[PDB]
Design a protein around this ligand. Structure first.
Ligand SMILES: CCCCCCCCO[C@@H]1O[C@H](CO)[C@@H](O)[C@H](O)[C@H]1O
Ligand SMILES: CCCCCCCCO[C@@H]1O[C@H](CO)[C@@H](O)[C@H](O)[C@H]1O
Ligand SMILES: CCCCCCCCO[C@@H]1O[C@H](CO)[C@@H](O)[C@H](O)[C@H]1O
Ligand SMILES: CCCCCCCCO[C@@H]1O[C@H](CO)[C@@H](O)[C@H](O)[C@H]1O
Ligand SMILES: CCCCCCCCO[C@@H]1O[C@H](CO)[C@@H](O)[C@H](O)[C@H]1O
Ligand SMILES: CC(C)C[C@H](N)C(=O)O
Ligand SMILES: [Br-]
Ligand SMILES: [Br-]
Ligand SMILES: [Br-]
Ligand SMILES: [Br-]
Ligand SMILES: [Br-]
Ligand SMILES: [Br-]
Ligand code: NA
Ligand code: NA
Length: 501
């Protein structure tokens, strides 16, 4: 007795909503520009074929396998694949990663809502040609919303509107998640994914019509899709690319796995998986990449775009792009569409990374969905205060959980499933129910190329990448405590298990 996806389409759209989020529209544009445009597009594609696709199939398999036995989370699932105590411990990262990521992700997701509400109502800055005179009012606007430190103190000071909108955002996440898999996440995916797509396509079209003295949107596209084989030898290009592949595909977050545990034992994962991965890549390389960069390039030429890209993650999407839109007509409504697009793109993703925790409390602590959802909401809402109030706390969570964490966790889930659990049993399991079959070549990729590929990166990472403030220790301290709290629950679960047995 376990919730299941009602419909094939509902399932595919929920898994595409999982993947397609603030990642395709905020991160991808920046990552692609920072690393030389078309330069970044070669390693990004190979990373999709050698890491994204195999890992996407592996996670679906693991999740579906688990769900057939009533287990949607990695501490349970890892233990099934590998009957070892250390399998439960390693499996804890599959609750910790999505949880930590959720803590800052839902906060950023709320900004987009707040901005949308202000653009719609026209409570946005009125810029007075001087590039800085147009950018400044918007930089000031975001800065008041999140409360960027004016002094030396590493202290943020969210506006009350910002803060209340985070309550509303949390409330909307819960109101979906509390309704469950089919009547909440699946009903929501069916509405949001179309809406999202139509919004994107409209903004893409509206952006190609941009032409100024400094360029056109067509300039931005060229920059984006013009090879530069002289970066290929840079580790920093491939790192960025692979890293992007993880975040973007939601790989390593334990989220694909949990969603898959609601797929019926017999249902197909091979085609379904490949479709959701492909929908993601389309959504970023066609939609996400054709908005921010072309628009900045049209207004500032190329050099200045890359300069803005390098500036910050949130500069382009929260300051530059709205500043640009303010300089075209029906621009304020253009910004509304942009933030309303980001909000739906974050909302369908944030409910995905909150579900592993909910699934754990329901599956292992036998909690009711209503309680599992409220308690998880409590933990996320509470811990998020660290992200709202402590400068660079978001950066530190993003680093350990959403950067290092997911890669190490991708490699871990593959070794366990495909080496420890057994490469052939893995392969069999992946293909069972399959409408199509995984191409035979991917058996060797999955077993040798993929884990190798990752192991190499993960080494160059720990080696080539003390120079931080002391407040980083407040965040690290707290997220280590989160890991222990989760280990403790895993402990409590295996015990209730010993007694129910
Ligand atoms: C006899 C059943 C087969 C063994 C696997 C079922 C239990 C999975 O294993 C354990 O279950 C706990 C919940 O019960 C999880 O929270 C633990 O993390 C996991 O250790
Ligand atoms: C459950 C966790 C609560 C811990 C303390 C939270 C205090 C937040 O409180 C609110 O923060 C806002 C944002 O700046 C302010 O605008 C409000 O005036 C303030 O009351
Ligand atoms: C979707 C509804 C959101 C309601 C939140 C409103 C937050 C109130 O915030 C207040 O708004 C005033 C007017 O702008 C300001 O002048 C106040 O200083 C500010 O604290
Ligand atoms: C060392 C022994 C560990 C005991 C801690 C138990 C964890 C509490 O957990 C509870 O256990 C119950 C019993 O089945 C379940 O019915 C509840 O739903 C569950 O939340
Ligand atoms: C470790 C994370 C800390 C979260 C607790 C934040 C406590 C906020 O506290 C309140 O915040 C308001 C908004 O800036 C201020 O106006 C109040 O003076 C302040 O007391
Ligand atoms: C944390 C994940 C849900 C992130 C999502 N894959 C995105 O790119 O936004
Ligand atoms: Br992407
Ligand atoms: Br970024
Ligand atoms: Br504000
Ligand atoms: Br200080
Ligand atoms: Br307008
Ligand atoms: Br309960
Ligand atoms: Na999404
Ligand atoms: Na994505």
């Amino acid at each position: 007795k376990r919730e299941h996806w009602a419909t094939r389409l509902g399932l595919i759209l929920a898994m595409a909503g999982n993947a397609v989020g603030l990642g395709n529209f905020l991160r991808f544009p920046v990552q692609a520009a920072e690393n030389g445009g078309g330069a970044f597009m070669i390693p990004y594609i190979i990373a999709f074929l050698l890491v994204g696709i195999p890992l996407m199939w592996i996670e679906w398999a693991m999740g579906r396998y688990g769900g057939a036995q009533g287990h949607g989370t990695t501490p349970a699932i890892f233990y099934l694949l590998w009957r070892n105590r250390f399998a439960k411990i390693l499996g804890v990262f599959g609750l910790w990663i999505p949880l930590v990521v959720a803590i800052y992700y839902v906060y950023i997701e709320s900004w987009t809502l707040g901005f949308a509400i202000k653009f719609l109502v026209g409570l946005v800055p009125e810029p007075p040609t001087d590039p800085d005179s147009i950018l400044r009012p918007f930089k000031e606007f975001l800065y008041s919303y999140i409360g960027v430190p004016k002094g030396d103190e590493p202290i943020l000071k969210p506006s009350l509107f910002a803060y209340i909108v985070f309550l509303i955002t949390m409330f909307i996440n819960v109101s979906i998640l509390i309704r469950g898999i089919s009547k909440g996440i699946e009903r929501f995916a069916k509405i949001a994914m179309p809406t999202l797509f139509i919004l994107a396509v409209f903004l893409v079209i509206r952006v190609f019509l941009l032409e100024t003295p400094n360029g056109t949107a067509a300039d931005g596209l060229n920059f984006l899709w013009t090879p530069d084989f002289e970066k290929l030898k840079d580790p920093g290009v491939w790192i960025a690319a692979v890293g992007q592949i993880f975040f973007t595909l939601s790989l390593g977050f334990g989220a694909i796995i949990t969603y898959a545990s609601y797929v019926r034992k017999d249902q197909d994962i091979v085609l379904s998986g490949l479709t959701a991965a492909t929908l993601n890549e389309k959504a970023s390389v066609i939609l996400g990449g054709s908005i921010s960069i072309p628009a900045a390039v049209a207004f500032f030429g190329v050099a200045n775009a890359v300069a803005i890209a390098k500036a910050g993650a949130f500069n382009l999407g929260f300051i530059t792009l709205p500043a640009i839109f303010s300089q075209t007509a029906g621009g304020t409504f253009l910004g509304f569409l942009w933030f309303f697009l980001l909000f739906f793109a974050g909302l369908t993703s944030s409910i995905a990374i909150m579900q592993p925790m909910i699934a754990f409390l329901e599956d292992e602590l036998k909690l009711s969905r209503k309680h599992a959802v409220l308690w998880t909401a409590a933990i996320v809402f509470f811990s998020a205060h660290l992200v709202m109030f402590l400068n660079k706390s978001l950066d530190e969570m993003d680093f350990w959980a959403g950067t290092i964490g997911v890669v190490f966790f991708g490699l871990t889930e593959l070794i366990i499933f495909f080496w420890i659990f057994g490469a052939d049993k893995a392969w069999e399991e992946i293909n069972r129910g399959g409408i199509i079959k995984v191409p035979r070549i991917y058996y060797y990729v999955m077993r040798y190329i993929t884990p190798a590929f990752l192991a190499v990166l993960l080494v160059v990472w720990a080696r080539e990448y003390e120079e931080t403030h002391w407040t980083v220790w407040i965040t690290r301290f707290y997220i280590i405590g989160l890991f222990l709290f989760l280990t403790f629950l895993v402990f409590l679960a295996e015990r209730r298990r010993n007694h129910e047995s």
